[PDB]
Ligand binder design. Structure first.
Ligand SMILES: [Mg+2]
Ligand SMILES: [Mg+2]
Ligand SMILES: [Mg+2]
Ligand SMILES: [Mg+2]
Ligand SMILES: [Mg+2]
Ligand SMILES: [Mg+2]
Ligand SMILES: [Mg+2]
Ligand SMILES: [Mg+2]
Ligand SMILES: [Mg+2]
Ligand SMILES: [Mg+2]
Ligand SMILES: [Mg+2]
Ligand SMILES: [Mg+2]
Ligand SMILES: [Mg+2]
Ligand SMILES: [Mg+2]
Ligand SMILES: [Mg+2]
Ligand SMILES: [Mg+2]
Ligand SMILES: [Mg+2]
Ligand SMILES: [Mg+2]
Ligand SMILES: [Mg+2]
Ligand SMILES: [Mg+2]
Ligand SMILES: [Mg+2]
Ligand SMILES: [Mg+2]
Ligand SMILES: [Mg+2]
Ligand SMILES: [Mg+2]
Ligand SMILES: [Mg+2]
Ligand SMILES: [Mg+2]
Ligand SMILES: [Mg+2]
Ligand SMILES: [Mg+2]
Ligand SMILES: [Mg+2]
Ligand SMILES: [Mg+2]
Ligand SMILES: [Mg+2]
Ligand SMILES: [Mg+2]
Ligand SMILES: [Mg+2]
Ligand SMILES: [Mg+2]
Ligand SMILES: [Mg+2]
Ligand SMILES: [Mg+2]
Ligand SMILES: [Mg+2]
Ligand SMILES: [Mg+2]
Ligand SMILES: [Mg+2]
Ligand SMILES: [Mg+2]
Ligand SMILES: [Mg+2]
Ligand SMILES: [Mg+2]
Ligand SMILES: [Mg+2]
Ligand SMILES: [Mg+2]
Ligand SMILES: [Mg+2]
Ligand SMILES: [Mg+2]
Ligand SMILES: [Mg+2]
Ligand SMILES: [Mg+2]
Ligand SMILES: [Mg+2]
Ligand SMILES: [Mg+2]
Ligand SMILES: [Mg+2]
Ligand SMILES: [Mg+2]
Ligand SMILES: [Mg+2]
Ligand SMILES: [Mg+2]
Ligand SMILES: [Mg+2]
Ligand SMILES: [Mg+2]
Ligand SMILES: [Mg+2]
Ligand SMILES: [Mg+2]
Ligand SMILES: [Mg+2]
Ligand SMILES: [Mg+2]
Ligand SMILES: [Mg+2]
Ligand SMILES: [Mg+2]
Ligand SMILES: [Mg+2]
Ligand SMILES: [Mg+2]
Ligand SMILES: [Mg+2]
Ligand SMILES: [Mg+2]
Ligand SMILES: [Mg+2]
Ligand SMILES: [Mg+2]
Ligand SMILES: [Mg+2]
Ligand SMILES: [Mg+2]
Ligand SMILES: [Mg+2]
Ligand SMILES: [Mg+2]
Ligand SMILES: [Mg+2]
Ligand SMILES: [Mg+2]
Ligand SMILES: [Mg+2]
Ligand SMILES: [Mg+2]
Ligand SMILES: [Mg+2]
Ligand SMILES: [Mg+2]
Ligand SMILES: [Mg+2]
Ligand SMILES: [Mg+2]
Ligand SMILES: [Mg+2]
Ligand SMILES: [Mg+2]
Ligand SMILES: [Mg+2]
Ligand SMILES: [Mg+2]
Ligand SMILES: [Mg+2]
Ligand SMILES: [Mg+2]
Ligand SMILES: [Mg+2]
Ligand SMILES: [Mg+2]
Ligand SMILES: [Mg+2]
Ligand SMILES: [Mg+2]
Ligand SMILES: [Mg+2]
Ligand SMILES: [Mg+2]
Ligand SMILES: [Mg+2]
Ligand SMILES: [Mg+2]
Ligand SMILES: [Mg+2]
Ligand SMILES: [Mg+2]
Ligand SMILES: [Mg+2]
Ligand SMILES: [Mg+2]
Ligand SMILES: [Mg+2]
Ligand SMILES: [Mg+2]
Ligand SMILES: [Mg+2]
Ligand SMILES: [Mg+2]
Ligand SMILES: [Mg+2]
Ligand SMILES: [Mg+2]
Ligand SMILES: [Mg+2]
Ligand SMILES: [Mg+2]
Ligand SMILES: [Zn+2]
Lengths: 252, 91, 112
RNA sequence: GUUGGACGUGGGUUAGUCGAUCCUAAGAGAUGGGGAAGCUCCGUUUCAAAGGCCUGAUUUUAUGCAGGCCACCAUCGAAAGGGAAUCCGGUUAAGAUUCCGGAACCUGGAUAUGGAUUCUUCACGGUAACGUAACUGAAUGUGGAGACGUCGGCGCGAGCCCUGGGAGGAGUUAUCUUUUCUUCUUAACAGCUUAUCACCCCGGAAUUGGUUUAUCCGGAGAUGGGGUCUUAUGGCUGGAAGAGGCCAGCACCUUUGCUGGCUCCGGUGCGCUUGUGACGGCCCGUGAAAAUCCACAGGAAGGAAUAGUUUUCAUGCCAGGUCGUACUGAUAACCGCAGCAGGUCUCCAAGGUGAACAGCCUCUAGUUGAUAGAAUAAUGUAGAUAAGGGAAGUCGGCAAAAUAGAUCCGUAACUUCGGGAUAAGGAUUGGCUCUAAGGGUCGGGUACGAUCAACUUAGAACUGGUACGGACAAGGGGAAUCUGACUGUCUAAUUAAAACAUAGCAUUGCGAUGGUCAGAAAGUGAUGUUGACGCAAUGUGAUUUCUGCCCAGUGCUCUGAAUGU
RNA sequence: CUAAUUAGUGACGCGCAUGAAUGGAUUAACGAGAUUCCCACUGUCCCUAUCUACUAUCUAGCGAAACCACAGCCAAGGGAA
RNA sequence: CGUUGGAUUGUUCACCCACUAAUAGGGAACGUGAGCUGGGUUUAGACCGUCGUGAGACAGGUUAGUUUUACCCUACUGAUG
């Protein structure tokens, strides 16, 4: 039979990201002298819409400490930051929405976005519109910090790892119904070519494990093992449970 | 004279998509097309384009807001909670 | 009733192919191609069209004399007056308060 | 066939300004390298000692070293994207923004005279917005232009359309028409001048005012008075009447002239096409890049009185290469075996009727091509009509017929309150002759008058073989069942559907030392310019309502067990 | 409902073998979707008739193809019936 | 010598209405598709029921699904010689 749809995506032909209009990668400043000893000041020169993104970017310019020139950065904008505002980044820096501080330097309950996984990676976690992470504790010996990510997971990372105070802007985007095919259409038009989706059960056997039969139906359990091999994994992969989730979610 | 009984702005969709969907949408649309009071200059000139982006007609200041509304409940409480924890540092 | 043809190989309505109709001394109608309109230069501080400055397509600015490219105040062909007004007042007051900031913490060190 | 896109023989394509050329787009692809037995694969700034400008140092001299920068790291990729600069008249058998004539502009290289500037060295003026013929400015830095969606009404420009007077030429004239048709034009470029917006100065506002078709603006300074700016665009003049257009009057085998005259002044707009401005609507869509050009911040440095600085002011000199340039562009110059009723990207667009880029008739231009002659049997193909009945025909109302524009009246169940609805059902509609309502502009001391230019709407008489959306154009309607929510999609060439998709609903995996996926391999790759409001994997299928019981089996899964394999 | 209905619709249900996102039930609006009746309409029919154009047909010129064991009048008989 | 008109069904068959003198039964390659039609059956699309782990199956239900050529010989109808 045929190579199924989820196998063809990895070869990246018609499936690569539609990148032309994007403002450029959002990152924190490089972690340098200023940021790990002192603080350094910047101005948000603009806050701007990035294509295929939920949340606005903020263009933030700084002075180059080692050379006379301006150096401009692209930040994900936290809700409430504004044009003309001064941004402070460094180990010793006041605790205010929009500033970037090492996770060690903020008290528990602090709310931060675009937080680094390792120190220096210029931010990894909690970048999507509406999201943040909460600092749930410190271990000053071995200087770690325990945080809770948007997924509900709780991870422990270096207290040197930087984050930015506040939550990411443009929240509530997903509360509004798309209402029609076209709105979805233009949505994925600026992301990648994932839409619309043919059901495997509407296909012929060559095309898909679910394909075929004189009635539409899966024909065997749609829960597939991790051990499964490419061309086998479609449906519910490695599911530990299945069915309507009753009762409260929200991990203890 | 009152033009429509319920649908309001949402009457552009006519009979389509089902009432509950139109209900939800009408809400956030009223939200997102509104003029908001400007923190900085005091007039209500703040309108939207590009969800998350709220700028002032005169005074030209742009603020990062919620997707369909200027300030969102979460960011609001977050604001005060940062205020709280900050004042714990100086005093 | 008299119709007209493009004067160049390019058959299509692209922005570089903009056309105008003109009556000649031959007494007949004829197309003449038209360069894209130039736009006014903008203040770097604010972004209004800055007054006093002539508006040409970029390379034509090299064919014109310097008075068309400036106004007589500092930051002339660059910033918008009222913007320059601001960075004067701001500069001054900040450079002042900078004195106020030093002598106050000069005493704070001495009495504490 | 005397004709031809045929046959024979020749002729023909002229550029500093039109294109290529230059730039960058998706993308393509060398190089230090890393894979691979290898043809080769990967990577593109990537684990690399990756390169070249400005001038100074030379007065053996030609270019070694002295500074200081710049670490930007190939290149290819648009004859519709970006982009230095040209127009009008004339001219050929066939070329023309390419030739001729006149009149310009750009770029590069040279430069000298004039003007400006300076004894207060690197200009003055204006309260200001800002003005100008000029008015030195290295490194470095920064700003701007290039440079950007779509729809809507409103304002304005251009060309076209309509039209008055006059000056010409043409047509009709039994009769009628101061008539019908036609000529009356002005390029790039240059000077002065011209603008919505924006901005400055004076002033200090409730009795709130200003104001758009569209409700937006003002103590963060409105209304008012006075000014500043962009030059889209228009006006007058230069170009330039000498050109071109239209006439008359002579010359004569010719090349072909010669001589004249006139080419003038207005009007109108929900007109049409196109351009453009100030605004408004929309988005989980917010709608390229680079070359290149200019500006400002900076002040390195270089500079005068016995004479210096200036080529962003004026004028002057030289140069501008290579390739394409004919013609067709389609019912005969392309692709379909062909001079095939098929296919194949696009610009310009007159008058009437009418809502109209509809149909129907016309002007300009172009055609009049498609074997022909004679007859008009059957049967056909394509176009029409039929008395009384009215689906009795048929698997089935298939085919056909009926309906239809516009104004007015009138309109049910049901409904997600948005619809259903042109529901259904009705009346009216020509011609001609009148009445009424609807506007512009100018002078009024600190009630009205005068003038000019527009088809809309309603009402009233008269009139006809009762006709009048007179051709053209133009919905049949109603009551239910099954089914898919809807718009959308597919079997090119027997299936368009109830199939697929969709929004909505639900489930699953994953915190990057990762999930899913690619590859022979790799210092390899997609998601990823990404981070759970995320990416990936399934199912169901808008709304409302509701989703019961069963984990023994097959799967999937587990902070579980342990002495069996 | 019809004069008359293996049709249609409303009921009934020990339902060969209905049934809950293998989604169940309901559902305004929409459909070149399948089905039933009604009004209008009509050459669909009773039952046929007539007209126009171009064909066919006859002439000049031009001029293919399919197919072809050999061929081409029947009744019966027998015979691979 | 005649043996019909209709309602339901793709139907043959069946069954009712109605007329009539009567509404007899059969053959002709179960007469008759280069004569038609294409509703059924019986390819490829698709829904449901039943069966199957599945691909798929069903003599179960349902919907959509290209009907080619005569100019020859003979026969037949007419027409010259
Ligand atoms: Mg990419
Ligand atoms: Mg797709
Ligand atoms: Mg799906
Ligand atoms: Mg789907
Ligand atoms: Mg299928
Ligand atoms: Mg398979
Ligand atoms: Mg399987
Ligand atoms: Mg299957
Ligand atoms: Mg199913
Ligand atoms: Mg040409
Ligand atoms: Mg366009
Ligand atoms: Mg000027
Ligand atoms: Mg100036
Ligand atoms: Mg200076
Ligand atoms: Mg011949
Ligand atoms: Mg020849
Ligand atoms: Mg030749
Ligand atoms: Mg050019
Ligand atoms: Mg070249
Ligand atoms: Mg390569
Ligand atoms: Mg190139
Ligand atoms: Mg090009
Ligand atoms: Mg171009
Ligand atoms: Mg010419
Ligand atoms: Mg010649
Ligand atoms: Mg020619
Ligand atoms: Mg010349
Ligand atoms: Mg000359
Ligand atoms: Mg020069
Ligand atoms: Mg001067
Ligand atoms: Mg620049
Ligand atoms: Mg820019
Ligand atoms: Mg562009
Ligand atoms: Mg020009
Ligand atoms: Mg004024
Ligand atoms: Mg003044
Ligand atoms: Mg002026
Ligand atoms: Mg108007
Ligand atoms: Mg915009
Ligand atoms: Mg400029
Ligand atoms: Mg010069
Ligand atoms: Mg050269
Ligand atoms: Mg040519
Ligand atoms: Mg031709
Ligand atoms: Mg053809
Ligand atoms: Mg005319
Ligand atoms: Mg022919
Ligand atoms: Mg003919
Ligand atoms: Mg003939
Ligand atoms: Mg006939
Ligand atoms: Mg008649
Ligand atoms: Mg009749
Ligand atoms: Mg009747
Ligand atoms: Mg009837
Ligand atoms: Mg019958
Ligand atoms: Mg019948
Ligand atoms: Mg039927
Ligand atoms: Mg019918
Ligand atoms: Mg029909
Ligand atoms: Mg009739
Ligand atoms: Mg109805
Ligand atoms: Mg009348
Ligand atoms: Mg009047
Ligand atoms: Mg039915
Ligand atoms: Mg549908
Ligand atoms: Mg449709
Ligand atoms: Mg097909
Ligand atoms: Mg269809
Ligand atoms: Mg079809
Ligand atoms: Mg639902
Ligand atoms: Mg390796
Ligand atoms: Mg579906
Ligand atoms: Mg879905
Ligand atoms: Mg129950
Ligand atoms: Mg029980
Ligand atoms: Mg079980
Ligand atoms: Mg029945
Ligand atoms: Mg019936
Ligand atoms: Mg029933
Ligand atoms: Mg039952
Ligand atoms: Mg039984
Ligand atoms: Mg269930
Ligand atoms: Mg079922
Ligand atoms: Mg409902
Ligand atoms: Mg329908
Ligand atoms: Mg014949
Ligand atoms: Mg004859
Ligand atoms: Mg013949
Ligand atoms: Mg032939
Ligand atoms: Mg015989
Ligand atoms: Mg015998
Ligand atoms: Mg019968
Ligand atoms: Mg029957
Ligand atoms: Mg029947
Ligand atoms: Mg019976
Ligand atoms: Mg009978
Ligand atoms: Mg028999
Ligand atoms: Mg038979
Ligand atoms: Mg036969
Ligand atoms: Mg047949
Ligand atoms: Mg059939
Ligand atoms: Mg079938
Ligand atoms: Mg069928
Ligand atoms: Mg069909
Ligand atoms: Mg034959
Ligand atoms: Mg025949
Ligand atoms: Zn403001």
């Amino acid at each position: 039979g045929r190579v199924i749809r989820n196998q063809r995506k990895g070869a990246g032909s018609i499936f690569t990201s539609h990148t032309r209009l994007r403002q450029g990668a959002a990152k924190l400043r490089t972690l340098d002298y200023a940021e790990r000893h002192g603080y350094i000041r910047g101005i948000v020169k603009q806050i701007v819409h990035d294509s295929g993104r939920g949340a606005p970017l903020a263009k933030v310019v700084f002075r180059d400490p080692y050379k006379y020139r301006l150096r401009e950065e692209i930040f994900i904008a936290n809700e409430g930051v504004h044009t003309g505002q001064f941004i402070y980044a460094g180990k010793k820096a006041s605790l205010n929405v929009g500033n970037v501080l090492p996770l060690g330097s903020v008290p528990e309950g602090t709310i931060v976005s675009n937080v680094e996984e390792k120190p220096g990676d210029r931010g990894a976690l909690a970048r999507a519109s509406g999201n943040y992470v909460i600092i749930i504790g410190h271990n000053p010996d071995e200087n770690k910090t325990r945080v809770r990510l948007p997924s509900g997971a709780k991870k422990v990372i270096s207290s040197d790892a930087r984050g930015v105070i506040g939550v990411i802007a443009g929240g509530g985007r997903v509360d509004k119904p798309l209402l029609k095919a076209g709105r979805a259409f233009h949505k994925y038009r600026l992301k990648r070519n994932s839409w619309p989706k043919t059901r495997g059960v509407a296909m012929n056997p060559v095309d898909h494990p679910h394909g075929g039969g004189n009635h539409q139906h899966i024909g065997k359990a749609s829960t597939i093992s991790r051990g499964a091999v490419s061309g086998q994994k479609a449906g519910l992969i490695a599911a530990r449970r299945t069915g309507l989730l009753r009762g409260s979610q929200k991990t203890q | 004279a009152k033009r429509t009984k319920k649908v309001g702005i949402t009457g552009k969709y006519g009979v389509r998509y089902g009432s509950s969907l139109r209900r939800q949408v009408k809400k956030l649309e009223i939200q997102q097309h509104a003029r908001y009071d400007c923190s900085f200059c005091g007039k209500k000139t703040v309108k939207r384009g590009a969800a998350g982006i709220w700028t002032c007609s005169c005074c030209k200041k742009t603020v990062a807001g919620g997707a369909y509304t200027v300030s969102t409940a979460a960011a609001a409480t977050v604001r005060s909670t940062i205020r709280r924890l900050r004042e714990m540092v100086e005093a | 009733a008299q119709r007209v043809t493009f004067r160049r190989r390019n058959p299509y309505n692209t922005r570089s192919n903009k056309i105008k109709v003109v009556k000649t001394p031959g007494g007949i109608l004829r197309a003449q191609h038209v360069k894209k309109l130039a736009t006014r230069p903008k203040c770097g501080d604010c972004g209004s069209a800055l007054q006093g400055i002539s508006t040409l397509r970029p390379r034509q600015y090299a064919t014109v004399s310097k008075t068309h490219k400036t106004v007589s105040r500092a930051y002339g062909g660059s910033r918008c007056a009222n913007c320059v007004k601001e960075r004067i007042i701001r500069a001054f007051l900040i450079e002042e308060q900078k004195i106020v900031k030093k002598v106050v913490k000069e005493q704070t060190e001495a009495a504490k």
